Design a binder for this molecule. Structure first.
Ligand code: AIN
Length: 1218
């Protein structure tokens, strides 16, 4: 894919003309991967990583020569000082523009001060300064973007080289170094830790330019305004520790918030995961209270953090006002007059140095601090202990064989028990060696030593021949599946086919929809254990090496294909190869001509299968061991009258912001139109400070009120969201995954709470300063409006033209990054499989590809943004040229102050308009969080919780149930699960239920609880389910789910989350379940805060807690849905005892797979495809032995079946005829 940057001239490189052909492709349609350009030859992953590795190897060699800790920063700085110093050269010619440009504004406004129509030479020099002003604005606005691309490109090159190294080392890490760390500690080295090199370079030249820019700003400020500058510079300095104090206090508040926020999100994951449970038990009032209090405590901290961010972002807005008010509060109280040229040179210089000192210098320090942290962490990673490179193959004498002698080594040196103990064996060509030994003998470290992956501690190994390693764990990575099959080797179609069809993969390749060349899903998500096992086996067959170390490869396959390959392929093709094979399976011990047996690193015996059998020693014994969004968003927070007040406060903040500068302008005008006469200093500076304090107060009020209204929008949208998802029918959770909904509560509501209010107030603030600039120009030179409406339209269309591609680039920048981390993650898993093959050469190349492709995406991300920024800055430069020249062609009308105000604002337009547009896009893609949230507030609610027509307070009293033609179905328009269901349940009746789960067992329960309103008619004690409030039905019903769910918090919550009862009944219930000792032996007997879902509890204990809950409820109807499905037999029968003793007076519905559960049945509901076909007493149903009940009973065995039938008859006669 040719890269127009490769062969584009300087003009079409500074203007990114070379990138237009891409926009004309994105405007029409969506950009896919194949449409991205290719990365320059000097940006490939290899070239960069190899240069940096050469420098870093040189530096570690030099340091070890000096015997001092080797520095990685030195390797970097040596590798990237040539490029990143010429970058600094343009940094100088750019910040010197930023600093000199004001000194040209000064000489424009100075011609305006002494304007004389006749002196056309002064006019021409004013045009000269305007032209050089445009020159500065253009080397700042047009040429800044090639420079900024190149700075971000230095950062990209550093990141890519560092990723290449990190990957190479990760490949060469030794188990001693690897097992210490975790694959995550590495993948985060690439994900979040090397991504610190994309940004360090961005401002890494403000380390010496922020200081140097500030010194030159201060020096010019001296030469203009005497000491007066020091006051503004003092406030500007304070913004450094002041912004740092904001940062520290807001980080404290953010972490204190995060505690509450993650408590809320954990409670949310629990309520969503077990939402079915909560609805059934009718507790969502409790969890509603719990999360209402959690969110009130979190919103207190969010509102405090937002108030502080409001006072911060109002201090960035008012910053220049306080900085130029302390500056001319000092400059006028010292006998010096105010002049528009000096004022607006000073305001422009303060804008420059304020951006520099509070946003570019603090950013530079922060990011180089994180970059040094990252460099040191990668340093430690790259100094970790490596494997000893394959003991250099002595040019073989044709001897394909391996001998290990008395090898003893450790997982870790500290262990007194070595992995192996003086083990010696030699394998020569053609020998079929089956390795046998109990688990834990050191299989991993065993073959690691055989591979040479385990450094010697005792013994010695001679290795001559190629090796293919299959680990017990199969391994398959992210990439072309043919990359796995060839494992990076050259393609042989015929032998490829033989390898593929040898494992009978025709079946598996039919299991693949995309055939045998499928691009494997991310990190192998498309394969199971057996599938990856077969992939590994095929890879092994492919290489045809001289050695075959297999660690129980057949554990994932059945005997059929394993025997096929073993006798036809392994014992015929691979037996000629030196096979060292582990095997748990007896079926292939038959085929081991040579067997070698070990026990816990001890040499049991070596010999043939025949000898091992003849010795009398058993194998088993040795082995066995859009615009509705914005409207509905601003409405959810405040009453539209408060939005009118918000608009008025925004406008007044901005009007006072612009009017302090207009007051300096009027001040210059009324000092010029004078003289001896002094200005009314008290009056003029009083109004000046009035406007300044009005601007600061309105900035703070605007920020605080915008944050308050939008955080209140988040709080009200969250309340509606949660009150709608508690009342959202179970269907809305079946159609959606637990993770999708909870994402809307963590990520989306974090945007609405934390970032979207801030991003949106920053957008409004920068937009209103943009409009202040535009309107000052349009109000001093009204004719400017005529150029605007082209620019506006152009801008608008440009912004339409751009955002089409730069949303398909920002999507390619992100959809191609994940492979970079995925290849690392996968290679880390099968690093032993890799290094068994000399393959650090090729897998390095696949990672080089992945990194190159993501660097193509990042190259387009870097360059489309610079294209758009070049054109936005050309818009702003046209603005500056028409306010700079358009003013001088109008100098008869305008006086000094007017031009000062207008142009000083135009110069600020530069960059501030770009931030306006960035923030507009940020809002417009963060308002998808708002749209994706308001999607939930408006959501179909299930029946009301409380109707006005209520049953008697203690209803039901008899526990009678009436089913009449009740049909149920997961969702309207879907398949039915209950079919013409009709049945009576008398008071205190015991009715078992048999059927398939979801074929009518659970659906009938859901209909009973009205999870989804069913067809037909359900009465209880002459009262219908559907016409009564959902709680008034569910609360008075008690149920035990298939899986009993515990909720984090106190045992009292799990027992009585309303605290409507006393501790006496709680302990009665806990004694009934005989967990009384289990809890009283805990520090918090009634306040025992359990682990996550009681993760320190057994399934039986959680089931017993649910039993205690049901006992406490004392409802007249009990429901059990396969509660006896995942319980131990002993506590199972104990629970049966408790249920049959306590709930005797209540009607009981039992849904069980164990038939002991139903011997007490008064009736049994047999469901065939959801139809209640047999409805009688159990033994009566057994009398018709053609009954399905009889079939299922016999399916457990005729002995137990006959015993159960006799017991059923006995209980039948015992009840009916005592
Ligand atoms: C006013 C302005 O936009 O200054 C900036 C320039 C570049 C990036 C960010 C900012 C900012 O406002 O924080």
């Amino acid at each position: 894919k040719p890269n127009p940057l490769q062969d584009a001239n300087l003009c079409s490189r500074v203007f990114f003309w070379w990138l237009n052909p891409l926009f004309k492709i994105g405007h029409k349609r969506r950009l896919e991967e194949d449409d991205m350009y290719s990365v320059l030859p000097e940006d490939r992953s290899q070239h960069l990583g190899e240069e940096l590795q050469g420098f870093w190897d040189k530096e570690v060699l030099r340091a070890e020569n000096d015997a001092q800790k080797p520095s990685l920063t030195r390797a970097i700085i040596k590798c990237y000082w040539k490029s990143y110093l010429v970058l600094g050269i343009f940094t100088l010619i750019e910040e010197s523009a930023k600093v000199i440009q004001p000194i040209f504004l000064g000489k424009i406004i100075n011609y305006f001060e002494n304007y004389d129509p006749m002196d056309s030479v002064a006019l021409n020099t004013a045009y000269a300064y305007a032209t050089v002003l445009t020159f500065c604005t253009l080397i700042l606005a047009i040429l800044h973007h090639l420079y900024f691309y190149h700075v971000q490109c230095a950062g990209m090159r550093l990141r890519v080289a560092m990723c290449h190294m990190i990957y190479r080392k990760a490949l060469r890490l030794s188990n001693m170094a690897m097992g210490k760390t975790t694959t995550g500690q590495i993948v985060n080295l690439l994900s979040n830790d090397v991504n610190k090199f994309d940004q360090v370079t961005v401002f890494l030249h403000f380390l010496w330019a922020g200081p140097l820019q500030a010194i030159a700003v201060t020096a010019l400020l001296w030469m203009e305004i005497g000491i007066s500058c020091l006051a503004g510079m003092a406030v500007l300095i304070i913004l450094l520790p002041l912004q740092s104090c904001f940062g520290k206090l807001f980080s404290s508040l953010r972490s204190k918030t995060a505690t509450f926020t993650d408590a809320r999100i954990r409670t949310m994951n629990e309520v969503i995961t077990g939402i079915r449970i909560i609805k059934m038990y009718a507790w969502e009032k409790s969890f509603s209270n719990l999360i209402t209090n959690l969110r009130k405590k979190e919103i207190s901290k969010i509102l405090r953090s937002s108030c502080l961010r409001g006072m911060n972002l109002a201090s960035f807005f008012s910053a220049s006002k306080i900085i130029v008010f302390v500056t001319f509060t000092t400059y006028v109280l010292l006998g010096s007059v105010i002049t528009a040229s000096r004022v607006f040179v000073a305001v422009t210089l303060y804008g420059a140095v304020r951006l520099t000192v509070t946003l570019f210098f603090p950013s530079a320090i922060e990011r180089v601090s994180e970059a040094i942290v990252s460099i040191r962490r990668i340093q430690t990673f790259l100094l970790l202990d490596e494997i000893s490179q394959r003991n250099r193959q002595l040019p073989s004498d044709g001897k394909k064989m391996v001998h290990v002698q008395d090898f003893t080594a450790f997982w870790d040196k500290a262990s007194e028990t070595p992995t192996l103990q003086g083990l010696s064996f030699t394998v020569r060509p053609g020998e079929l060696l089956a390795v046998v030994g109990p688990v834990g003998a050191g299989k991993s470290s065993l073959l690691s030593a055989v591979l040479g992956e385990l450094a010697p501690s005792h013994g010695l190994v001679s290795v001559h021949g190629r090796i293919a390693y299959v680990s017990q764990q199969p391994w398959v990575f992210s990439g072309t599946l043919r990359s796995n099959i060839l494992f990076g080797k050259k393609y042989e179609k015929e032998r490829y086919e033989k390898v593929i069809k040898a494992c009978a993969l025709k079946k598996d390749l039919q299991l693949l929809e995309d055939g045998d060349l499928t691009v494997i899903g991310d990190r192998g998500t498309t394969l199971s254990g057996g599938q990856k096992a077969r992939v590994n086996l095929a890879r092994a067959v492919y290489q045809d090496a001289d050695i075959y170390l297999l660690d129980d490869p057949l554990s994932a396959v059945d005997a059929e294909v394993s025997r096929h390959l073993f006798e036809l392929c392994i014992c015929q093709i691979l037996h000629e190869k030196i096979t060292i094979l582990v095997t748990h399976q007896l079926q292939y011990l038959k085929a081991a001509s040579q067997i070698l047996i070990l026990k816990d690193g001890k040499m049991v015996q070596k010999g043939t299968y025949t000898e091992f059998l003849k010795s009398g020693i058993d194998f088993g014994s040795l082995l066995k061991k859009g615009f509705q969004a914005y409207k509905n968003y601003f409405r959810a927070g405040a009453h539209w009258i408060v939005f009118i007040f918000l608009i008025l406060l925004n406008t007044a903040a901005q009007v006072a912001y612009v009017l302090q500068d207009w007051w300096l302008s009027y001040w210059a005008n009324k000092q010029s139109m004078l003289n001896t006469e002094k200005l009314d200093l008290n009056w003029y500076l009083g109004i000046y400070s009035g406007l300044t304090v009005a601007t600061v107060l309105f900035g703070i009020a605007r920020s605080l009120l915008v944050f308050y209204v939008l955080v209140n929008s988040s709080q009200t949208l969250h309340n509606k969201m949660f009150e709608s998802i508690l009342k959202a029918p179970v269907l809305f959770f079946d159609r959606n995954p637990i993770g999708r909904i909870l994402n809307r509560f963590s990520k989306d509501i974090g945007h609405l709470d934390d970032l979207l209010p801030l991003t949106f107030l920053d957008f409004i603030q920068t937009l209103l300063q943009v409009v202040g600039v535009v309107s000052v120009a349009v109000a001093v030179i009204p004719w400017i409006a005529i150029p605007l409406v082209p620019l506006g339209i152009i801008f608008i269309f440009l912004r339409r033209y751009f955002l089409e591609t730069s949303r398909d680039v920002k999507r390619l920048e992100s959809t191609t990054r994940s492979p970079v981390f995925s290849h690392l993650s996968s290679s880390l898993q099968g690093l032993w499989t890799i290094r068994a093959y000399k393959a650090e050469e090729r897998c390095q190349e696949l990672f080089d590809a992945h990194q190159d492709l993501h660097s193509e995406a990042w190259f387009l991300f870097l360059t489309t943004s610079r294209w758009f920024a070049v054109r936005l800055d050309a818009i702003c430069a046209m603005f500056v040229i028409i306010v700079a020249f358009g003013s001088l062609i109008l100098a008869k009308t305008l006086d000094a102050g007017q031009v000062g105000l207008a142009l000083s604002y135009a110069l600020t337009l530069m960059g501030m308009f770009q931030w306006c547009v960035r923030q507009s896009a940020e809002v417009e893609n963060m308002m998808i969080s708002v749209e994706r949230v308001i999607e939930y507030t408006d959501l179909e609610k299930e029946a009301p919780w409380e109707y006005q027509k209520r049953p008697p307070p203690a209803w039901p009293h008899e526990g009678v149930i009436i089913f009449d033609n009740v049909n149920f179905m997961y969702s309207p328009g879907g398949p039915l699960v209950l079919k013409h269901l009709t049945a009576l349940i008398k008071s205190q009746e015991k009715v078992g239920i048999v059927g398939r789960t979801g074929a009518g067992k659970s659906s009938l329960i859901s209909a009973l609880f009205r999870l989804s309103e069913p067809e037909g008619k359900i009465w209880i004690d002459k009262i219908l389910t559907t016409e009564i409030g959902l709680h008034d039905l569910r609360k008075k019903m008690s149920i035990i789910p298939q899986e009993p769910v515990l909720f984090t918090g106190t045992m009292r919550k799990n027992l009585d989350p309303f605290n409507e009862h006393t501790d006496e009944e709680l302990w009665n219930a806990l004694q009934e379940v005989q967990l009384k000792e289990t809890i009283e032996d805990l520090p918090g007997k009634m306040d025992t805060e359990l682990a996550e879902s009681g993760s320190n509890f057994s399934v039986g204990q959680r089931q017993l807690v649910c039993l205690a809950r049901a006992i406490l409820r004392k409802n007249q109807i009990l429901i059990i849905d396969e509660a006896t499905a995942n319980v131990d037999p002993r506590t199972d029968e104990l629970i049966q005892k408790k249920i049959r003793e306590k709930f005797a007076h209540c009607t009981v519905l039992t849904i069980a797979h164990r038939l002991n559960t139903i011997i007490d049945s008064d009736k049994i509901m047999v469901l065939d495809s959801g139809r209640l076909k047999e409805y009688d007493e159990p033994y009566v149903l057994l009398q018709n032995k053609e009954s399905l009940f009889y079939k299922m009973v016999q399916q457990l065995g005729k002995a137990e079946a006959a015993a159960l039938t006799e017991t059923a008859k006995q209980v039948y006669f015992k009840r009916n005829y005592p």
